Structures are given as structure tokens and as C-alpha cells.
Symmetry: D2
Subunit: 414 residues, 4 copies
């Protein structure tokens, strides 16, 4: 039984793919495999106050199909909260509500997703010129293999730690903040260091400050202060569906300009309101004579070691150009992520995949990896396309349009 398309991973991207498949007139067979037990969308960072960075109109389908049964508005309506939500006049739902939205959509979905199913490898099918791929899936009980004419890889970002710093019992990446934090005796973390100057770092510091009144926090970051995230309407157009064509068709010179002028829309920047809330927090503490937030600016975390009951964090100060030690209970590294890389899963099919001058994967406008004639099956990427398609490649900004374009590409090539 050979499937038209197999989806590796079930995050919002393949969920929107599943939705695009169901809404398409095309009769396409599909299968989806998720390693986790259920949809799990950055749960380690599902902090109480945390808010979507994207408008509710940027959902699973609305920009493609403005009257979808899987739209956020449909979700609100079924949950009987649409009117309530409208009264709030806020385009940004909480991260917590968006997670329910993902679950709700997955549930309404006709197709059944296979959970606890890790894709361990992708191999060429019996064939030359290869017309299918073989997908190795490992469940808790057995292992199996499925065959597909197309695959879509959407396995998400991978946590990046500071150079020379490894995860440990007392050194956590922000992606695993709540996992570790809920385990711990509160009074066990009176001193916390958080490295980074982006949204994650800011949200964690905020949470720590609001969660217990005695916790002392050290925010270590290279900038002089948090930098604001730009989502004003003209700059925000880099996230438009149409901006994908501009980026894609544009020269390397133009591509560089997107990153040069608008990196501050997405990376290493914090939302206005969180910045202002932290500042109010710090200000009221000074009035009260009880400072707790210590902002260590122009600085990098360069090392961590345990030493008795303390975590010894080594900080490099750019101002003085030297290092020093900071003793805390826990070090949280909110130091970001590296992009998706298909190269690992692909194993050997990589030999038939064409790379560019800089050594990265060539990708067509329709998100399909460029291959030699030896390979006739499709490898689509949702993620890992920053260099070809632009800043929206790993965001929720363009799920509806991308997923539809991939489904169209697959129907066209049948």
C-alpha cells in the first residue's frame, strides 16, 4: 500500500498540511507520524501569561480558505467563546488557547495521526529511477516500514546552547524550562540566571518574578537592554504570502537586505508589552527598596560548572573585557534554536539532493527539494527553508498558503 504523501512530525505545519489535504478536492492518500504521545507545541514554554506572536487570522487555513471549518474563528464558535473573545479586541490569543486550538483541529480532522511513532530513517524505494521512498517508523512495541510517493518533513527547530555549555541537572535550555521547573522544590531555586535577550528569556524572567516574591534573577544578555520586536505594518509585510515570492525570486543581495533590515522582527527581540511589564516590575521593586531583577548587560554566558550546592556560571563582560563567576541555583539558557535540517533523516537520499554554493539544500518555490534525475519522488520541507523562502519558513505566519501550495504541487505531479 503506497501512500501519495507521508508527513514526518505533527506540529502546526503538518497539521495545516493535513487540513489542506482534507479540504482539497484531490483524493490523496496520506499518513502522519509523530514521536510524542499527542500534539505537543512548545509545552516547556507554555507559561501562564504567554501570548501568540501572530494574529488569530494567521491560523491553520484562513488565508487560503476564508471559510474553513478549521479556522480559529470556527474553533472559538464551537467552544462558545467567540463573542467573549471579540469583546476583548485583541488579535493575539494566549499560547495556552492556541494549543487547545491545535488539539481541537487535530481532533475534528478525519484522518488519524499515528502517535508514539518516531521516524528513524528515510530510504529509497525499490526503484531506479526512484519513484518512492521507504519510511522507517519505530513504535514502543514494534518497528515498521511505509512506502510513499512523496514525503513532507516538518520536524521543527532544534535547541541551541551557548558554545561550551551543556545541558545538565542545573543547566536547562529554555525549551525545557517548565519540564524541570515543576519538578523542583520552590525554595530550591531562590537564585536563577537566565541567559539571552530574546522573547524566551524575557518571558521566563517575567514568570520567575511574578511566581515567587523572593526569587533573585540575573538576566545576562549581550545588548544594553532588551530590543523591541518590530511588527509595525510595513515591516510586518515580510511575513506576507507575497513576500515569499519577493524573497525567493530576489537576488542574494536582496535576500541579505531582508535579514539586514528586518532581523529585528523575529530574532533576539522582545514584545513591547513584556518589555514594559518587566520595566514596571523593576521600577516598583526600587521604590520598595527590594531589588531582585539584576540586568547584566553587554555580557555572554561562556561556561557552567557545579560546585557543591551551587551552579557556577562564568560570565564574560564586553565592557571590561574579562570573565567572572556568578553562583546561582539554576542556569536557564534562553539562547535560541537552529533551523530544521533534513540531511540527517534523509540518510543516503541526500546524495541525489543538490546543494548550493554555500553548501545548503536547493529548494523549489513549491518547497520541494531539488534532486538529480535519479530521484523522482518528492521531498517537501516545512522548516529549513530560511535561505530560500525567507523569515516566515519556521513561523505560523504562512501555514495556510504553504500547506496549500504543497498539496497543489503533489496533485499536479500525480
Amino acid at each position: 500500500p503506497t501512500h501519495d504523501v507521508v508527513g514526518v512530525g505533527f506540529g502546526p505545519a503538518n497539521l495545516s498540511l493535513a487540513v489542506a489535504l482534507e479540504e482539497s478536492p484531490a483524493a490523496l492518500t496520506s499518513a502522519f507520524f509523530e514521536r510524542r504521545a499527542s500534539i505537543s507545541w512548545h509545552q516547556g514554554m507554555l507559561l501562564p501569561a504567554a501570548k501568540m506572536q501572530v494574529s488569530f487570522l494567521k491560523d491553520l487555513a484562513t488565508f487560503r480558505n476564508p471559510a474553513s471549518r478549521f479556522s480559529f474563528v470556527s474553533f472559538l464558535h464551537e467552544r462558545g467563546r467567540l463573542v467573549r473573545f471579540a469583546n476583548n479586541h485583541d488579535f493575539f490569543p494566549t499560547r495556552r488557547e492556541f494549543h487547545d486550538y491545535l488539539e481541537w483541529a487535530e481532533s475534528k480532522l478525519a484522518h488519524e495521526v499515528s502517535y508514539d511513532s518516531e521516524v528513524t530513517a528515510i530510504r529509497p524505494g525499490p526503484g531506479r529511477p526512484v519513484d518512492s521512498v521507504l519510511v522507517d517508523v519505530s513504535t514502543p512495541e514494534a518497528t515498521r516500514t511505509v512506502e510513499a510517493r512523496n514525503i513532507v518533513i516538518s520536524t521543527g527547530l532544534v535547541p541551541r546552547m551557548p558554545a561550551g555549555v551543556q545541558s545538565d541537572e542545573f543547566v536547562w535550555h529554555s525549551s525545557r524550562f517548565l519540564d524541570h521547573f515543576r519538578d523542583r522544590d520552590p525554595r530550591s531555586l531562590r537564585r536563577v540566571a537566565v541567559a539571552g535577550g530574546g522573547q524566551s528569556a524575557a518571558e521566563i524572567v517575567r514568570f520567575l518574578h511574578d511566581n515567587r516574591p523572593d526569587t533573585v534573577v540575573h538576566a545576562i544578555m549581550p545588548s544594553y537592554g532588551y530590543v523591541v520586536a518590530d511588527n509595525t505594518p510595513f515591516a510586518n509585510q515580510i511575513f506576507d504570502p507575497a513576500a515569499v515570492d519577493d524573497y525567493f525570486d530576489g537576488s542574494k543581495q536582496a535576500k541579505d537586505a531582508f535579514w539586514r533590515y528586518h532581523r529585528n522582527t523575529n530574532y533576539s527581540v522582545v514584545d513591547d508589552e513584556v518589555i514594559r511589564d518587566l520595566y514596571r516590575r523593576g521600577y516598583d521593586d526600587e521604590v520598595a527598596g527590594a531589588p531582585r531583577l539584576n540586568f547584566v548587560n553587554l555580557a555572554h554566558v561562556v561556561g557552567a560548572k557545579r560546585i557543591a550546592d551551587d551552579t557556577r556560571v562564568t560570565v564574560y563582560s564586553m565592557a571590561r573585557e574579562e570573565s567572572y563567576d556568578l553562583d546561582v541555583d539554576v542556569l536557564v539558557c534562553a539562547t535560541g534554536y537552529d533551523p530544521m535540517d533534513p540531511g540527517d533523516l534523509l540518510g543516503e537520499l541526500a546524495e541525489h539532493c543538490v546543494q548550493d554554493a554555500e553548501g545548503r539544500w536547493q529548494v523549489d518555490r513549491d518547497y520541494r527539494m531539488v534532486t538529480t534525475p535519479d530521484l523522482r519522488c518528492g521531498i517537501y520541507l516545512q522548516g529549513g527553508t530560511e535561505h530560500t523562502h525567507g523569515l516566515s519558513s519556521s513561523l505560523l505566519s504562512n501555514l495556510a498558503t504553504r500547506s496549500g501550495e504543497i498539496v497543489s504541487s503533489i496533485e499536479r505531479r500525480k
Copy 2:
């Protein structure tokens, strides 16, 4: 050919009714009559900067049917502006764009509306009890009559002038501001008086100021300054579909409390952004030493008379408790509207319609007038239900739900 339902008037209310009809599985026959040439939604007040007072989610259908082909989001999508609109992060479209939305929906609609068709009267059909009404329609050429088992009256508000002031060539109601304004030589409106302290008054004064740099404006109003319109989320709940049941089922006491505490959500109040814009305008003029906006507070317009080249406006000052005259070129009365009243159109049928203690029409929860057993056909009101259904009755706030409830009521009674 007796229709299941005839709609009198084609504003947003009956348009949403038409949409509800098409969306319903029920096969209901209908006809709609509009006296204007096309949809015309307060065009006299379609000022350049004017913005909706209602969120885009409160459209023709979305609260009833979250995936409607007639939703504002569908409209944006077809007009290839959804992405652009989303980038703006504003829930409130311009009045101009909303007008576009109404036209767009009307066009997409299967039913063809009869324009240029004034309903002059509604009369009882044959038989007793009366099972149908007869609708008299006057077109420019001819006149005819159509029969219906149900009728929905949605003819809109009616302009209300100050007591003892009549509109003229130089005394306009705000509803007819742009009609008159575009037809006049710019150099002939150097002095304008605007009466009222509500949204209309504020918007007109703003426009006059932005429009020509030398125009002098007198804003005459009873309050000490513009009062802000409340649309904070808890108070704004009075516009919820569910709030209709609370108002309806509630005692007269409870009803009066809605009006007592939350009148300032709708009447005689101005949107925050417009108030602040007017204040910056006035402030910058003082810095420049060139004041043009004269705010005449604690005051009413009580008379107007034309004398040579001047419109002489008589103003009563509450502070001094005396009257005085103000000479201007034009007086604009932004003094509001009276509610829809089905009484005029109904004529003979009114005798079978039951009134309450205060002499107002009784209406069922499904917007159907209460009648004696002599009358079996359904008369539904979209508008004119402030006293039974609450503050949302004349607004866009609840179009989707109301229209659906009326269509359901009609399908039910057929069955």
C-alpha cells in the same frame, strides 16, 4: 404568488435577513423592497476618516455561522486585502470599506432586490382570520401589490431635529451633511455651527477642521465637553447575543438599569480617538495663535432664522440662563434620531397589534409583534425594539443572530 416573507427596506438588517434565508436549509420564498436606487448606508455621513463602531467580527453572519461565504473576512479575501488588513491590527474597518462590504454581499446574494420601490402601505389579506398581508409598492413608473404570509419591517431610524428648529437650505440635519456640503462653493462656508455632543457632531467638526484651514466652527453642546464612548469589555457585553435574553426576560427595573448605567455606550458619546484628535487640533491652533474651534458648552440650540447673508442661530446658555444669537453661514444639527416605528406603515393592521402600559408595541422574543387571534400572519421588527430587546436593536452588533432567529421563527410556523 404569496411569498413566505417580504422585507421592507434593504439596509444591513434586511440584507442580513436575505443572507440568513439563503444560508438556511429551509426553502422559503421572499421578496425585498428598497426605495433608494441601491444600498445606501448613511452616505450623508460617509466622511473621509469615519470608522465603524463595531468590530469586523460583527458582520452579516459570522456570530451565527463562523464559516459564512458572506463574512467580512470572505469579503477581504475576495478583494485581495485580507493580508493587508490583518497587518493593520485594527478591529474597526472604515465606514467606506464597510459600505463596500454591504454592496459586495448584496451582489453575491442570489436573490435580486427590487430597488426604487417604496412600500406605501401594508393591508390585511383576504379572509378572517387574516393569514396574509398585502404589500403596496410604488415604483417610479407604476405601482403594484404583493402578498406575503410574513413581513419583516426594517426601515431604519428617522432624523430628529431640535424642538422648534426646522431644516432648510442653511439648516441641515447631520444625516444630510455631505449631500448639502458637496453642492456648495467652499468660500461660502467660512462659518459653521454644529449642534450636538455625540459621535456625528464630533466627526463633522473634525472634518470641517481638516477640510479647509480658515473655516471657523462653533460646537454647541449641553455637556461640559465631549463624553467618551464606553466599549471596554464588561460593559460591552450588553451588546452580546446573550444580553438580549437578559434584557428581554428581565423586569422593567432591570431594563431601566441597562439604560441608567450603560447609555454611554451608545448615545451622546464620542469615540476616544476622535475626542483626542479634536483636542490635539485645538491645542495646536492655540500654539499657532490661530484658534478656529469654539466649544460652546452647557448650551442648546433653540432656534434658527435666516437674515440676509447670515443664518442666525439662537443659543440657550445653561450657565447664564439666558439666550443669545450667533451668526454663521450654516447650522448643522447633529442631534440624533428617533427609533423605527412600524405604526405608520401598518395602518389598518395596527388595530390587531397589542400595546403595553406605556402604549408601546408588544414584541415576542423572536421579534414578532404580538397580535390578537384576528391576525395570524407574522410581523417582525428589525429596529423599533429598544424597549423589548435592548440597546442592540438598532445596531450592527447583533445582525447575524437576530436574522437567524427570525428565519427560524418563520420556518417553524410554516411547520
Copy 3:
């Protein structure tokens, strides 16, 4: 030793008076008496997030003297927080910081205030006509009497509880919320009822929600939802120094209009940010399936009784027009205040104080009580002048100008 002026009470009002005295060229002798041990400015409501309802420019002196050593800006500068504050771009300091400001100013003040000194009575001095008053002061040790040519009464508002409800161990007025709250085992207050729809009620509910996650709160109020406080610039002008003259010189009709159109600026209304925050709180709880905030609208608290381990609150519902009981741990009444009334403290002198038609005290533009010629000494009111001077009489809005006008009045009669 006869003083030019004695001040009864030391809240912001008399502290601005003390400042006005020090800044005046006039050599005036004065004494101030406060019952409390130190300045205590609504400490029972100094909640963590609580913010001033007045701009930092409206401080002890700035509107009268733009370069005062007692301005809020001076305070920030000395506390080394001016630059930090400026970066925040918020005109509204916290209530906590403002308290700091009051203490700082009081300290910087040359004059020494007499604390733990309750003024028990004011009596006529020797002579006829009366040229001085005698002020009876009770300290913890002794009692004494001081003599003054003028007296300024600024004793603040007095808590008002719902009719038929009395303070008790489990029934608190909002003014004494933190006093009782700190004094209670946290697991003893799992169910709280808060009566009222104003700023205090909103702030207390917000606090309860944020303080422990398990607390269930009943917000009981007559409106359908919190009503927003109007502070938009035109309406906000009723708080201007100049608005005092407009209100004062205006007819009773005009005075009524101020209250009729602009009570939404001050009484029974909630700040936009607080309303918004409460609504988000309620919304997120619904998403989580763990509702805690129960909004009981169109309702009054009409009684309270203690029954075993429960405070039984009797609630009247306007919608159903019937009463029912509500069992909670504590009832907090955030039901507002009655104005300052100089009369209690005046005793014998009040005979010579002229009242108006409605039986209230007549007051001159300079805040001086109108007396029959039998009295020659000056009695000034800071507070208790809502009926003569308008809505700013009990606020921080106009401290600088009011205090200056009273000092001027006193200097000019000494002359």
C-alpha cells in the same frame, strides 16, 4: 500665642496648604494637627498594583508654582529616579510611590506637624464679634487648647456602608481591606464577596484573583458590568482650575449638568486598564476550565449575618426582583464614601454658619464658609465643597491652586 491659621488633619490637602504657606512671601504663623501617628493616605487600599488616578503634574504645587522644591519631579530627582521614571513614559505613578512622595514632602517641610493629636472640638474665642477660634487637641498624654485667627478643616471622606449593613469581624469596608486582610490565615479566605462597581471594588477583586489561585470571588454590583472611567481630555477639563470658576459662578441648572454628564469621570467607574485586566483574567480561567470570578450583576447587597463558619450575604437581584442568600468567608463593601462635613467639629460656631435652601453650608469662592457678622474669624474647607466648587473638591486634581487661594485669602484679610 495666637496663630494666623490652624490646620485640622494632615492629608495631601493640608500638606499642600503647608507647602503653600512656606512658599508664600507672607509671614504667617501656623499649626497642623493629625490624629494618626504619621501621614496615612488610604493605606488600607495600598494594593500592590494600585495606580494614581491623577497625572504626576497634579502634585502639591506645580500648577501654582512650576518650579517648586516640593514638586513630584523634584522628589524623583532627589530619589535618583527621575530618568528611570521618564523612560517609563507613564503619567500615572503608583499609589505607593505617591505615598513616598507625601512623606518626602512632609519631611522636607520646615514646619513640624503635630501627630497623635486629635482635634476634638472647635470653640469661639473671647469677644463678640468672635475674632478667633479655640481648638481643643487631645494627645495620648494630655489635652491642650490653641488659638487661631483662621482654621482650615481638611479631615477627609467618611466610609459609607450599604443601608442595613454594619462593619464587623467578617464585614469590612474597602477602606480597611488591607488592615483586616494581612491579619488573616490565607486558607481562611477561600470565598470572598465584594460589593460595588467602582475603582475600589475592581482593584480588590483583581488583587484577590492575583494573590492566591484558589480563591473564589463574587463581585456584586448594580450595573451590567464595570463602567469605564472617562479621562479623555475634553471631559477631563472639569478638573481644571478654571472649571472651578465655571461651576461656582454657574446656575444650579449648570451645576446639575456637570453631575448629569460627567459623573462618569469620578464616581462608580473603573479605569480602562483594570477593567481590561479583569476581563483577561476571567477569559483565561474559562479557557482553563477553572472559573473563579463570579460577576453578579444588576444586584445589591442588602444584608449580612454570621452563621457558624459562614458570612451569610443577602443579595437583591433586580432582574428577578427577589432576594437570596450567599455564603462566603468575608464580605468586603467597596461601597464608597460620604463627603467631609465640617459641622460635627464646629459645634457652637455652626449656629453662625449660613446654610442654603437645600440646608447645606454656603461657601465663598475662596473656600471660606459664609458666616453671619457674629463671626469674624475665617473657616476654610478643603473637602465638603462638592456643591459649591464641583467634582474636584475631594480630589488631588486641584491641590496646588486651592491651597494657594486659601493662603492668599488669609494674607489679604490680615491686611
Copy 4:
């Protein structure tokens, strides 16, 4: 008569210096020379809606003296507008009002400024070591020379045009926009091109759009859209008085970090409200079917030539790596400014003034140029200190403190 201090230029900087002098207990003699007829603070850009980029608390004196007779609050009070202003709850006055503030303060000032007085040169006074400088002043009638123990140079920024584009009758720098614009028949500016992506460019396009309903505007800029200006409270601290010490004492590495992370607080960025207003303007025009604002992004103006009534603008497109011609009536270059340079004016005295590795002037913390021992007189810079003191050097952000620091330095050395 040798003066303790002579001020070259009378903009906000030397005006705050004059104020600091008057408020100081020190009896210092001074003289100020301004070339223009009166205070003239970017009048070419005093557009109707234009707003200060700095809070009213950042005025001539308030951060140094919180109860100054020259504060903005004192100004409002005397102009009987304090209450009105307070009601409006806006920290940012209009540029127009701020200009009145400057005139008001200059007028209240006891000292009399010499206008129509251009400083043409600064020369060493008699003796070795040099204990004084000689200041050559050219008036319309005569020329004279004054002697000073110290000099403070505050001559402001100098307009910078695009490479290969010269000012002309139809090519204006933004600094001279209103000068040219008022002198033109309205029906002769139906097509305008504006080059630049900063505050000036945005403000001019806004004005053009709002001024006449038929004007067509081409906004040419290198970014994909306007980038928002960061003035959130943590990042905004780079403008703090204390941030000057951090920048000054910090290493070259730290200094670079200020510019790398926070250049978007000041250069090539546009205020949130202005961006939003332009976007609404463009949106409403699309609804009306009458587009007038053409945003030409990822582009530079590279040339201009007059060709029979059309100003022919040559535009380089980064996307297509191609150039092309655009015909308009006027080209406005809102392409920024170069910093103040004391070198111009100093002439012979440069020899006793020490440069750094990169060839820039060395300056002490108190804004005094570093000189060899052959020069003893003080040369102070208000402006031209970006490289030693940081981003606030040319701004209004820190007038009160800087001016006080300089007055103190002079009193201490006397």
C-alpha cells in the same frame, strides 16, 4: 576683554550651555555667536504634524536642576498652557511648540546672544603656552575678533546627499524641504520622489499625502518597509546620563555593541504612530481605487538629471540588480546627516589636538578635546562626540547634564 568662554553656534546645545552658565554660582563671562538672524531649529522640517522624538522632561535643564526657571513646565506655565498640556497626557510636544520653547528660553535669558555673526576661524592667542584662543567673527557690516580662555563648539550636523547626487533647483535635501516647497506653485509638484527610510522621509511623504489629494509620491528606500524606532524603556536607557559613563569607560568592543544592538533607536527608523498613519493612508486609498503612495523598496537613488521639465531619477533595484529611470517633478533626499566636525573651524589649533588610531579626535569625559601641552585653553565639543560619548551626543536627550558638566569643567580649571 578675554571671556571665560565663547560659544560657537546657538542651537539647543549652546542655549542649554547659556542656561547652565546663568544658573551656576560661578561668575563666568561668556559670549555666543549665531550665524542666522535668530534661533532656527530645523525650520525646513517644521512640518504641521511633526512631533518631538524626546520627552518634555528632557529639556534645557530639568535633569540637572529639577526646579529650573527654564524648564519646559515653566514655559507651559507662563504661556498659560500647562493645564491644557497635562490633560492631553502626551510626553511628546510638537516640534512647533518646542521651537517656541527655545525662543522663550533664549528671550528670558539674561545674556544677549550675537546673531548674524558667523565664526569664520579659531586661532591661537598670544604666548606659549597658548592660554587663549582668538575667535574671528564676520557680521554683515564688519568683522571682528574676540578672545577667550575656553571655547565650546556646537555647530550642528551637516546634510548628507546620496553619493553622486547634488542639490539643485529640483533636487532638495530634506533639511531644506519647506524652504523650497513654500516657494512653489502647488500645481507644479504633482509628482514627488522621496529618498530615504528614516523619520524625515516618512514625515515628508505623510505631509505630501495630506497636503494635496492629487499628488503622487514615490518613496524610495533600501529596506522592505519602514523599520520602527525603538524607544521601549530598557533600550531607551542608552540615552540616560549614566549610559554616557558606560559607553565612555567601556572598551571598543562594548562601544561597537551599543551601535550593533541599538542603532535602531535613532538612525534609519520611524516612529510607530507615523508608520501606522502612512499605512492607513495607503490602505484607504486602495479601498477608494485611487492609489498615490508608491513604495519602492529594496532600492537606492543613484542619480538625478534635469531633462525638459522632468527630473529624471535613476533608481537601483537590489531585487533585480538593475537600474531604471523615474520621471518626477522634484526629488527630495531625506538621506540623513554627517556629524559635527570641529576640524573645519580649528585650522592651526589642530596641531595641538590629539587623534586616535582611527584618526578621530580624542575627547575627555568632560567633553574637552585632548591637546598637547602647548595648548592650555579648553576646547569643548557639543556634537561630534559619537565615537567617545555615544548615541546621545547630537540629541536633545542629554542637554541638561552635558551643559552642566562643561560649565563645571570650566569653573574647575579657572
